[PDB]
């Protein structure tokens, strides 16, 4: 695992009611990640770039929606989400 | 892998059947092909060739070694 891949594994945080409740209650972070990322990649990336220790990672993939503007159809890209559990109180 | 003579290159050709009322239908003429084993002294062994009776006449007139050398020079596994 190299630094170049490390800087591309993560994309951004998720802003939603479910993510907010999870963070405020169980100390779980929700991230948008690269579609080809693996759980070990996500763990090492979070541990290196946020200085917190990761207990376990859960991932899920949501297919993009197909919808119409005017007279043409289009599709959005798939999004992979990561539920990262931290130990005790961190971040 | 075909009805082709190794020595002369003969192969089936096409033609017509012609009846007494002059009706014409397609046919082919085939060569008088078959397998034959020839003793080769230079290599102490039998070589099996698929050839015609005209191929045997050529072999009888020229010798087996000359014919085998010609085929090898033409690029055949003999």
């Amino acid at each position: 695992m190299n630094n170049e891949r490390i800087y591309q594994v993560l994309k951004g945080p998720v802003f939603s009611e479910k993510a907010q409740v999870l963070g405020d209650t169980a100390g779980v972070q929700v991230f948008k990640v690269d579609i080809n990322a693996t759980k070990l990649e996500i763990k090492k990336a979070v541990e290196k770039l946020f200085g917190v220790e990761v207990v376990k990672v859960n991932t899920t993939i949501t297919k993009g929606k197909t919808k119409r503007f005017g007279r043409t159809l289009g599709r959005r890209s798939d999004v992979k989400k990561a539920y990262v559990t931290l130990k005790a109180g961190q971040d | 892998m075909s009805k082709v003579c190794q020595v002369t290159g003969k192969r089936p050709v096409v033609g017509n059947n012609v009846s007494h009322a002059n009706n014409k239908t397609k046919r082919r003429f085939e060569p008088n092909l078959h397998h034959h084993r020839f003793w080769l002294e230079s290599e102490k062994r039998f070589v099996r060739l698929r050839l015609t009776t005209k191929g045997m006449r050529i072999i009888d007139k020229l010798g087996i070694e000359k014919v085998v050398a010609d085929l090898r020079a033409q690029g055949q596994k003999i």
Partner: protein, 60 residues
Amino acid sequence: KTKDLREKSVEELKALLDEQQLNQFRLRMAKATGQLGKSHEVQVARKTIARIKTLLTEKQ
């Protein structure tokens, strides 16, 4: 910036690339959170990353 970029050694260029990628990731995080009003920072970070890789290939 390529003018002064070319005036550096291989080891300096590789390090420069390293903190440039780190900075690009940090700007991406900041913009995703909404703390970054200016995106030309991200654009120039991308651009200089490309420039450094080009110069490294040329110099090697």
